[PDB]
């Protein structure tokens, strides 16, 4: 039967430091006992000074940064470009993620 | 598929259709609610255009929303149903979520928005009635009494009219209710509500009900005698002059 | 007879001008943005001595930054009042923080031109534009205190002092004058407390007028009665002053 | 299951539920009342799945509240227990039926006898002298099948309760916390607050 | 697109008037004439085929139509509103009744059916009423023979005999003459005939009229034998040449 | 656009008045005569068959009274048609009120219902009224025997003796001149023919022009007996009062 | 005539004319004086903000659809927001599902489409709202005019509103001046203002009343208001 | 009577549809646009009044491709003819995925032709105020076509349509006689931007600009495409020199 | 009240003014044709008239093939002819798919009338200015021809004609009928058949026809098809050695 899903592997680390924070994660992407690419960037800067990662199902991963990202753009066009804080930003998250409650974005996501 | 706009601005910023609904109340017959100290009461007038009805099963038209809480119009019968069905189906839906019965301003504010709502919907015209809607919040003795109009503008008086002659008898209370001193009694209450009415029901014992709502789900209408029995000690008021 | 949504040869939408004539002949309502917060005052306008005058609510609060004041058909505003404070709810369930003043505006003036019989653009099952305009002020940390008129036309502007209703085009040259961007909060309300007075058919008392302000601090509040009662009577002292 | 038992005698009908709400592993609440008041002469007990138990009881409830002021008129125990039929076997075949199993105890003021209604979520329906739902009946219909008489007081009715409330804390397997009863005559309602000892 | 016209086309006029219903009763007071007569075993229905050319094949139009094997319908007024009628009625026969109690419905009822179809088309948003009256024969078990004039505005009656359209006056007042209680069925196709033939200006023979009967069960018209209870159609359109042999006996 | 030739039906007149209805009624006022006279022990129904002919089967002719329930029955003035739809639609909410609550459905319930169903033309759909009015006579455990009338508005009430069609307030005049509390069926039968026949815009009064139904709860039994009166039984009675 | 043909826009009068489009139209002129203008490397949106009151703020007329596009508006405010918010749509489906940032061409064609559907069905109403289009894909700068008919047409420049009239002739003479401003934004903005004036009358444009919006080569499209533009007045 | 001309599927009492008559006026008002048929593909061009010297040169392009092989040219409203095509783009795409071969011409016209002829029927909607040229190369030869308002279309040697229909058609019908053999792709495309010079006479107060497109069996491999540089140069020179 | 003229209500003389007028615009197209029955095959003739020199004379035709075996002829506008004949096509190859035979042109015919009466009675739809004559060799009926209108009318006949001199064609072909006796042309080939149609239609008009002027279809069992300019102009040559 099909199954919607899978895993890529990788891992991730966000640390907050008293004036900056960091965000790390691993370049590989695998399925199985395969290595898929040796460099494909899991974590990005979204804007408003906010990187995310989504690790677990690279599918959903991307999707669900993407959804954000967009997620910022609109937040601009919405309230005169006001800067979205960051507990705005994971606040707005739980919402995208929340939303598919009953099919679930496979990932651990840190911002 | 039905959507026509038949209630819309006009030149001078008229809406018509809820204006000519306010004609359909003043051709209705009279209504009137002033409240006590300790209690409300609504009179209305019956029209005699045709006598020979069953008064036992003729519709009466101060009607129960809830156990504490009464509507009484001026206005299309058939239009008042429509608004005391949703009303009384607002007042068993509040009490089962919010698991306490609602508070006259509630119940007000409530049948108002649906007059309110036919004012600015396709197909639809206006409810040609106005109302008054009166009793005693929940755990509270401080009376209320409102009034709603085809417009869906509502508000509370300390005493109100609508329906024919609404003019007449609105004056009759302007000048007989004193804020300070309200009718702290049932009796001296319904007497200044049957007084008002005389003032146009033009001697009608049997052209004149009263309802007689006090706090806790405390509610009764007058039978013909009682009533008559304030119309002869007031015609005697007037005698004795 | 004639599209709802039609043009007239001048350009313009005749109901929603029609619209504005009926709030023409709405209870004045007036707004005044100072650097310490911005006042909202009403005409009660009660029809009738029996008619108990609190019972008028024509300022509500939409959010505890925000309230807002309408002129006109007041029916109409209860939808538009409701939409506006789930907005804000909405927003702040969302977004974990206050709706902006000019977003939650520009929401409100959403709804004003979805009317029609089949206005090929989406679902805007309105019979008529409505009948009232409305006065939204409020603060929030981008661009502080903020007075906005919202209109049936579904525009939207921003005024330092603005009157709507009966005694608009009268009140509106006083505020003219007697604005600067320095006044203090307590100026502008007595200003408006003036300004109310001379449009006013009645003689202006804590009863058949109501103010309100909104202010960092506290946000939102509706002056009650006595609190305003001595406002009244510090202005009488000031005019008779000179 | 919960306890819900009923029993119709001369003048009255009487109605016996327990009081304990358990989930899983823990007793959450010992003072629980699985009744609602449909009407001022009906009474109405029900037992069934976590949810819609209340949810149901509540449902009805305003129904026939709601039915009392459009018509100022209460509707015959009879006529209650017809129309709560039909809600459950709309249920039974609906996505997610109600599962629910009620008691409908009333007084027809027009007939001046007590009436007694046993329907199951599935929407079966009939009248008896006593009835219960869940394991209860198990132990309860044989027992009043020997010490029942239509003749019986009110008195005698809750000796009779007495004596199967006993039975059941003897038998059966849980803890039911004992019962809340109540009396449903021609005066309206009425709760026994002296059964945990009678 | 979409019927914008939701709202009804008939409406009552300040005088009390539904002014559509009026002028589709207009409509059929110009139609061709058309009778009805019932026997005490039998009824008859009858009506002019006023060919509109001498090219055109009269029988490829049938003014008299079945609905169901023992109810028959003829008419007055639009031929085209007449067709889509009768596709409804027979279908409505079956979908109300035969599926549903495996027999076909009794002439009051399948009447009851048709005048109900006519009325929304005097209530429904954007239609015209239909332009016709229809005259309906029938036989059912419980109620006999019967004949009933549905109309316009949905409203039908039950007739001992009478007729619709141009000469309807004229024709209803010759059949209260000869009409009465004890008619046998050959006896009202003859004084249809006869009223009839006042109403034709030309031609008038087996070729120019049309003429159908419910009377007794036809089992030389079922298709099949083998079943007792079937007894055949007692519904039976008569041929041109039954028609003129009844003729010469005029 | 269609707006062109939207006729409006459910709007207010300068007067709040409901043009369509005002109209309806007017179109009521030219059918035949109907009354309802409740009397102690039953109600009675009589029309007046607006329009007849020597060839209309009488027999088989019903276009005045219907059988809604055992225990409510109607009279028509208006547009035969339209009352069918209303009249079958009526006859449903009875079943549905039976098949809920196994009790027969109280008589004013189902006029509510049929009045609310008329009242909807009147306020919205643009569509036009029913051109109908009723006589509801029924029997109830509640209220016993009850006249009742409804109308193109929406609007019902209930009567001791009513009329509906054309000539009311002479009918209205002339009941309200012999009515008596105490009546009994049989005076009411009496008392109907009698109004009918002086209202009449025909020559006599005869049976084939009428239609006569009574609603008694006859004595030998205990239940409600609705009676619906056959050409014979009509001539018969017709006679008895002298009318001949 | 024209009375009778102008009660609905599905309506052609007896000459082949929409008077309700053109009526819509009328809209745009009563509307405040905007302008357009690009070179090879930008392109320009100045406009004029109009003020109710002296107490009033001046509506914000610059509308931006993505980092590449933007819009400029006369007439009917809330017509505008619908459409630039289409647009934004437009833009941001072009990015997440192509991974394309949309041709300016290409966002007038859905202009156009949009607008065109209001102008032949029953019920609805043209849009009162003139828009003047800028932006840099990958063809270089771009300006685009829309009209509520429907028809978009590409410039070098041009401008819609109030005496519009004056700051069209004016570019339709500074043509070959200002079109090779490459490289210099500076030059293409005062270039604009000096089209814009072309127009007033009334006043002079103050701080808080000139709004201008630039985007080219290496320019997100970008809105300068107030202080900012201070230094073109 | 008469405002047999204010709603679109009016039937005039001689019978006509007054609206769609009304949508050619606006069609005739526009500018002029033609198409010709040639021994192996058509060629489409059209005349684009430069209202000014900011129009950027070039850029502004009306002619339109439908799949692969489909060109389409039209007069009147331009939003119409846009929406047109893109119905007939939806069209042409629905046919090729259920069959898999590309739509052909004649097939084609009638998909255009059936949905113009939808928008007569109703009065909710407004006829399509353009006249189209279209066409193209398919399994059987190459299909010129010219579509009405009215949702009439028929097949051409040579159509025109727009302010100078007359003085295209005239010439075309020069062609026509003096070429019973057929013209050739690389002639017609000099010839029509002839015809276009020639036709812009009556707007010759206003300057334009030229634009064609071709689609020939030989010359484009049956695809659509537009006439650029040297090509376009050479075809504009061609008549730039019989202008005078 | 007036606007009982513009949309299909009843006008009080109980008249429906837009079926009329609808009945006008089959005439527009000022051209004339006519159908007979053969033997055993059904013919159609209609006049073919190409004003403009650019027009593909190719594509110039009133005549369709519904389907295998139906052919239909309309008289009136070009577009509301091609939107009955794709409904015809269309509601004869769904009869065949539904019921497992070829529909029938009668039955195509009454369906094509209900249709009709439809846009009678439902104000939104407008009626089709435009006469439809369908014909074939029906399996069971034989040579066939039924023709509809803009009221929902629909009939068979021997043979008809329609169009501005559908009259003086009409009483043609009866008086050629009252004489022969018969239904129909009692000849063995279609040719000839074909030739009796052109040549009555002559006489009729009187007007002499090139081969470019008509427009001929032939029914027969299996297969309906139309003629081309030389099919025609073949049978202009037979009728010519006749005269």
């Given at each position: 039967?099909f ?15 008293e004036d ?13 006992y ?32 993407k959804?954000?990202?967009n997620?910022?753009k ?7 470009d006001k ?13 995208l ?5 009953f ?9 | 598929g039905?959507?026509?706009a ?7 910023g008229?809406?018509?259709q ?47 929303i ?6 009484s ?13 949703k009303?009384?189906?607002?007042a ?7 698991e ?7 119940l ?6 649906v007059?309110q709502?036919?004012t ?8 040609g ?8 919040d ?13 417009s ?23 000048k ?28 009608g014992?049997?052209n ?6 006090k706090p806790?789900?405390?509610?009764v ?9 304030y119309?002869t ?9 | ?19 504005l004539?009926?709030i023409k ?23 009738s ?8 609510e024509?300022?509500?609060?939409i ?8 002129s006109?058909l ?5 939808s538009?009042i ?10 702040n ?13 520009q929401?409100v ?13 989406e ?5 008529r ?7 939204i ?9 903020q007075?906005?008129?919202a ?24 505020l ?8 203090t909060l307590?100026?502008?309300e ?16 804590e009863?058949?007028?109501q ?5 960092k601090?506290?946000?939102?509040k509706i002056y ?6 001595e406002?009244?009577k510090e ?8 | ?19 304990a709400?358990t ?6 609440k010992?003072?629980d ?5 449909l009407?001022?002469?009906?009474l109405?007990?029900?037992?069934g ?6 949810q149901f ?22 006529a209650?227990?017809?129309?709560v039929?039909?809600?459950?076997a ?6 997610r ?8 105890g ?11 209604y046993?329907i ?10 006593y009835?219960?739902?869940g394991?209860?009946?198990?132990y309860?219909?044989?027992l009043l ?7 019986m007081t009110?008195?005698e ?11 059941l804390?003897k ?8 019962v809340?009863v ?5 005066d309206g309602?009425?709760?026994v ?6 | ?9 008939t ?13 589709a ?19 008859v ?6 060919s ?6 009269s ?6 139509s079945?609905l169901?094997?023992?109810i028959?319908?003829?008419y ?11 596709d ?14 495996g ?8 009447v009851?059916?048709?005048?109900k ?44 005999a009478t007729?619709?359209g141009?000469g309807?006056?004229?024709?209803k007042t ?22 009839l033939?006042?109403?034709?200006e ?5 070729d120019?009229?049309?003429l ?14 083998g079943?007792p209870?079937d007894?055949?159609?007692?519904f039976?359109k ?9 003729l010469e006996?005029? | ?10 709007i207010?007149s ?12 007017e ?8 009354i ?19 060839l ?21 003035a ?22 809920t ?26 569509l ?5 009015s009723?006589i ?8 016993g ?7 193109p508005?929406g ?14 307030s002479?009918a ?17 039968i009496?008392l109907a ?5 002086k ?18 709860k ?11 009166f ?6 018969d009675?017709?006679?008895k009062?002298?009318?001949? | ?9 599905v ?11 053109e009526?819509a139209?009328?809209?745009i ?5 905007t302008?357009g203008?690009?070179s ?18 001046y509506?914000k007329?610059?509308?931006?659809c993505?980092?590449h596009?933007?819009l ?11 459409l630039?918010?289409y ?7 072009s990015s997440?599902?192509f991974?394309?940032?949309?041709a ?5 064609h ?23 289009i800028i ?13 509520p008919?429907?028809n ?20 339709e ?9 490459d ?13 814009i004036?072309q ?7 103050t701080?808080?009343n000139?709004?201008?919006?630039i ?7 970008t809105?300068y208001?107030?202080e900012a ?5 | 009577?008469?405002?047999y ?21 606006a069609?005739?008002?526009?500018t ?5 048929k ?12 430069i209202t000014?010297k ?10 339109q491709?439908?799949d692969?092989?489909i ?9 119409d003819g ?7 783009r ?33 009065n ?6 353009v ?5 193209g190369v ?5 299909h010129?076509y ?13 159509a ?23 013209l ?16 812009h006479?009556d ?6 600009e ?10 484009t ?16 020179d ?7 | ?14 008249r429906?003014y ?17 159908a007979?029955?053969?033997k ?6 209609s006049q ?36 009955a004949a ?25 369906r ?15 009626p ?20 509809t209108?803009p ?6 006949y ?6 501005p001199?559908?009259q003086?064609?009409?009483?043609n072909?009866?008086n ?8 129909h042309?009692?000849?063995?080939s279609?040719?000839k058949?074909?030739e ?8 009729a008009?009187?007007?002499e ?7 001929v ?7 309906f ?6 099919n025609?102009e ?10």
């Open positions: 039967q199954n919607p899903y899978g895993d890529n592997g990788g891992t991730i680390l966000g640390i907050a430091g900056f924070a960091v965000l790390a994660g691993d370049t590989r992407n695998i399925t199985d395969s290595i898929n690419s040796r460099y494909e960037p899991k974590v990005f800067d979204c804007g408003d000074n906010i990187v995310m990662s989504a690790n677990g199902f690279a599918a959903d991963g991307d999707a669900l940064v959804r954000f990202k997620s910022v609109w937040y601009h066009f919405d309230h005169n800067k979205l804080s960051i507990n705005s930003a994971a606040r707005n998250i739980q919402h993620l929340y939303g598919k409650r099919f679930p974005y496979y990932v651990h996501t840190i911002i | 039905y959507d026509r038949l209630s819309i601005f006009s030149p001078d008229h809406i018509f809820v204006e000519y609904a306010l004609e359909a109340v003043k051709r209705g017959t009279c209504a009137v609610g002033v409240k006590g100290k300790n209690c409300v009461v609504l009179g209305c007038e019956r029209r005699s255009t045709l006598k020979l009805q069953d008064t036992r099963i003729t519709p009466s038209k101060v009607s129960k809830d156990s504490h809480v009464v509507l119009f001026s206005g299309l019968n058939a239009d008042s149903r429509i608004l005391i069905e009303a009384r189906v607002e068993q839906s509040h009490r089962l979520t919010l306490d019965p609602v508070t006259v301003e509630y007000t504010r409530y049948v108002a928005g007059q709502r036919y600015q919907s396709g197909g639809v015209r206006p409810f009635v106005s109302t008054l809607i009166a009793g005693f929940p755990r509270d003795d401080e009376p209320k009494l409102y009034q709603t109009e085809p869906g503008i509502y508000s509370s008086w300390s005493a109100q009219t609508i329906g024919r002659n609404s003019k007449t008898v609105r004056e009759f209370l302007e007989n209710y004193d804020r300070k001193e309200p009718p702290a009694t049932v009796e001296e209450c319904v007497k200044l509500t049957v007084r008002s009415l005389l003032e146009v029901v033009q001697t014992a049997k004149i009900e009263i309802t007689v709502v806790d789900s405390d509610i209408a007058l039978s013909s005698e009682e009533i008559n029995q119309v000690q007031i015609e005697q008021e007037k005698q004795e002059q | 007879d004639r599209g709802v949504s039609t043009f007239s040869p001048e350009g313009r939408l005749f109901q929603v001008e029609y619209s004539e009926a002949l709405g209870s004045t309502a007036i707004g005044i943005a100072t650097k310490e917060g911005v006042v909202l005052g009403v005409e009660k306008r009660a029809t001595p029996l008619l108990e005058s609190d019972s008028i024509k300022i509500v609060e959010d505890r930054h925000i309230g807002c004041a309408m006109g007041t029916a109409d505003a209860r538009m409701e939409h506006a404070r789930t907005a804000a709810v909405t927003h369930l969302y977004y974990d923080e206050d709706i902006n003043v000019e977003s939650l505006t929401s003036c959403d709804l004003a031109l979805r009317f029609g019989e089949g206005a090929s653009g679902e805007r099952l309105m019979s534009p409505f009948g009232v305009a409305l006065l002020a409020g603060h929030d940390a981008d661009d502080g205190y007075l906005f008129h209109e049936p036309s579904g525009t939207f502007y921003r005024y330092n002092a603005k009157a709507i209703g009966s005694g608009s085009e009268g009140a509106q040259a006083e003219l004058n007697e604005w600067h961007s320095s006044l307590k100026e502008a007595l200003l408006v407390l003036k300004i109310l007075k001379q449009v006013m058919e009645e003689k202006l008392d009863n058949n007028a103010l309100s302000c909104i202010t601090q506290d946000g939102f009650d009665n006595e609190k305003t009662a406002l009244i202005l009488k002292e000031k005019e008779a002053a000179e | 299951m919960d306890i819900i038992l009923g029993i119709r005698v001369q003048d009255s009908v009487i109605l016996a539920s327990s009081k709400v989930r899983g592993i823990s007793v959450l010992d003072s009342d699985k009744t609602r008041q009407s001022p002469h009906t109405m007990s029900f037992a799945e976590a949810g819609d138990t209340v009881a509540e449902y009805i409830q305003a129904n026939i509240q709601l039915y009392s002021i459009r018509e100022d008129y209460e509707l015959s125990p009879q209650v227990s017809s129309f039929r039909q809600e459950l709309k249920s039974i075949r609906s996505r039926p109600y599962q629910v199993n009620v008691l409908i009333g007084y027809d003021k027009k007939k001046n006898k007590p009436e007694l046993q199951d979520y599935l929407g079966t329906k009939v009248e008896l002298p009835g219960a739902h394991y209860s009946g198990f309860t219909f044989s099948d020997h010490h029942y008489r239509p003749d009110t008195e009715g809750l000796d009779l309760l007495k004596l199967c409330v006993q039975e804390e038998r059966m397997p849980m803890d039911f916390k004992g809340i109540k009396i449903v005559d021609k309602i009425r709760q607050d002296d059964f945990q000892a009678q | 697109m979409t019927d914008r016209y939701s709202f009804s086309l409406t009552f006029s300040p005088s009390g008037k539904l002014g559509q219903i009026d002028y009763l207009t409509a059929v007071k110009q139609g061709v004439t058309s009778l009805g007569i019932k026997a005490t075993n039998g009824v229905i009858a009506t002019e085929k006023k509109s050319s001498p090219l055109a094949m029988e490829t139009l049938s003014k008299v079945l169901t094997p023992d028959g319908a003829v007055s007024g639009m031929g085209p509103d007449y067709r889509v009628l009768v409804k009625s027979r279908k409505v026969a079956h979908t109300s009744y035969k599926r549903i109690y027999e076909y419905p009794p002439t009051k009822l399948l009851s059916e048709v005048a179809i006519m009325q929304e088309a005097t209530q429904s948003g954007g239609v015209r009423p239909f332009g016709v009256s229809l005259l309906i024969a029938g036989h059912d078990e419980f109620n006999g023979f019967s004949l009933y004039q549905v109309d316009p505005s949905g409203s039908y009656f039950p007739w001992k007729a619709i141009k309807s006056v004229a024709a010759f059949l209260e003459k000869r009409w009465n209680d004890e008619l046998e069925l050959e006896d009202a196709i003859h004084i249809a005939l006869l009223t033939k006042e109403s034709v030309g031609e008038f023979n087996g120019t009229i049309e159908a009967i419910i009377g007794d069960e036809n089992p030389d018209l079922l298709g099949y034998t079943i209870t007894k055949g159609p007692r039976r008569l041929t041109s040449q039954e028609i003129n042999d009844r006996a005029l | 656009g269609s707006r062109r030739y939207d006729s409006r039906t459910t207010f300068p007067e709040g008045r409901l043009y369509q209805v005002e109209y309806a009624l179109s009521i006022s030219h059918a035949g005569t109907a309802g006279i409740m009397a102690s022990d039953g109600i009675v129904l009589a029309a007046e068959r607006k329009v007849t002919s020597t209309l089967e009488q027999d088989t002719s019903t276009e005045k009274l219907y059988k809604l329930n055992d225990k409510i029955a109607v009279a028509v208006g547009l035969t048609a339209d009352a069918e739809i209303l009249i079958n639609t009526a006859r449903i909410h009875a079943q549905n009120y039976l098949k609550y196994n009790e027969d459905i109280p008589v004013e319930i189902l006029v509510r219902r049929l009045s609310d169903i008329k009242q909807g033309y009147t306020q919205h759909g643009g036009r009224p029913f051109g109908v009723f509801y006579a029924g029997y109830d455990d509640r209220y025997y009850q006249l009742y009338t409804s109308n508005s609007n019902y009430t209930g009567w001791k003796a009513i009329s509906v069609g054309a000539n009311t002479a209205q005049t002339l009941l309200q001149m012999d009515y008596k509390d105490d009546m009994k069926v049989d005076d009411a009496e023919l009698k109004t009918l026949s209202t009449t815009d025909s020559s006599a009064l005869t049976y084939d022009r009428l239609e006569f139904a009574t609603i008694r006859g004595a030998n039994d205990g239940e409600v007996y609705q009676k619906i056959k050409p014979q039984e009509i001539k009675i017709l006679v009062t002298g009318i001949t | 005539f024209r009375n009778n043909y102008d009660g609905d826009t309506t052609f009068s007896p000459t082949g004319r929409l008077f309700q489009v009526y139209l009328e809209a002129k009563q509307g405040s004086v302008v203008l690009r090879n490397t930008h392109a320009v949106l100045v406009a004029l903000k109009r003020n109710a009151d002296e107490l009033s703020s509506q007329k610059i509308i931006k993505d980092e596009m933007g400029s508006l006369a007439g009917l405010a809330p017509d505008a927001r619908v630039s918010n647009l934004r749509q437009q833009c941001n489906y997440l599902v991974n394309r940032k949309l300016v061409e290409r966002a007038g859905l202009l156009c489409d949009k607008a065109q559907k209001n102008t032949q069905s029953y019920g609805g109403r043209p849009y009162g709202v003139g828009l003047l932006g840099y894909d990958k063809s270089g700068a771009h300006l685009l005019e829309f009209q008919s429907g978009v047409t590409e410039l070098y420049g041009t401008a819609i509103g109030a005496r519009s009239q004056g700051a069209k002739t004016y570019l003479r500074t043509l070959d001046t200002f079109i090779k401003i490289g210099n934004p500076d030059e293409l903005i005062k270039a604009g203002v000096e089209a004036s127009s007033l009358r009334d006043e002079s444009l701080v808080d000139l709004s201008i919006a985007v080219g080569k290496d320019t997100p499209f809105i208001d107030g533009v201070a230094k073109y007045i | 009577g008469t405002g001309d204010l709603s679109n599927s009016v039937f005039s009492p001689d019978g006509r549809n007054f609206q769609v008559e009304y949508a050619v006026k069609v005739e008002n526009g002029t646009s033609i198409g010709i040639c021994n192996d593909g058509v060629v489409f061009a059209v005349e684009k009044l000014s900011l129009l950027v040169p070039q850029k502004n392009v009306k002619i491709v439908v692969r092989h060109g389409c040219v039209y007069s009147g409203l331009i939003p846009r929406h047109l095509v893109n119905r007939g939806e069209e042409a795409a629905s046919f090729k995925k259920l069959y898999k071969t590309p739509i052909p011409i004649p097939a084609f016209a009638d998909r255009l032709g059936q949905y113009v002829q939808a928008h007569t029927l109703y909710s909607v407004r006829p399509f105020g006249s189209t040229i279209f066409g398919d399994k059987n030869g190459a010129l010219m579509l009405e308002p009215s949702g009439s279309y028929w097949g051409y040697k040579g025109a349509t727009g302010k100078g229909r007359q003085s295209a058609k005239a010439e075309l019908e020069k062609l026509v006689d003096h070429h019973p053999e057929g050739s792709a690389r002639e017609a495309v000099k010839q029509a931007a002839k015809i276009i010079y020639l036709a006479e707007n010759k107060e206003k300057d334009f030229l634009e064609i497109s071709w689609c020939s069996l030989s010359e491999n049956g695809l659509h495409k537009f006439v650029k540089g040297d090509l376009l140069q050479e075809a504009i061609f008549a730039q020199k019989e202008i005078n | 009240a007036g606007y009982d003229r513009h949309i299909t209500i009843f006008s009080p003389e109980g429906l837009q079926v009329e007028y609808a009945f006008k615009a089959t005439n527009q197209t000022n051209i004339n044709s006519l007979v029955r053969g055993d095959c059904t013919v159609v003739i073919k008239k190409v004003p403009d020199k650019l027009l593909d004379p190719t594509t110039v035709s009133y005549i369709f093939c519904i389907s295998r075996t139906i052919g239909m002829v309309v008289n009136g506008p070009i577009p509301d002819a091609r939107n794709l409904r015809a096509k269309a509601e004869a190859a769904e009869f065949r798919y539904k019921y497992g035979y070829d529909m029938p042109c009668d039955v195509l015919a009454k094509m009338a209900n249709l009709s009466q439809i846009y009678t009675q439902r104000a939104y739809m407008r089709l200015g435009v006469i439809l004559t369908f014909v074939s060799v029906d399996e069971e009926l034989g040579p066939s021809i039924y023709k209108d009221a929902g009318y629909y009939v068979g021997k043979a008809t004609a329609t169009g001199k559908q003086e064609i009409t009483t072909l009866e050629h009928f009252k004489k022969s006796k018969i239904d042309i009692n000849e063995e279609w040719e058949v074909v009796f149609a052109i040549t009555h239609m002559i006489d008009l009187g007007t026809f090139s081969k470019n002027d008509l427009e279809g032939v029914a027969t069992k299996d297969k098809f139309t003629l081309s300019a030389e025609i073949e049978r202009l040559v037979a009728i010519a050695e006749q005269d």
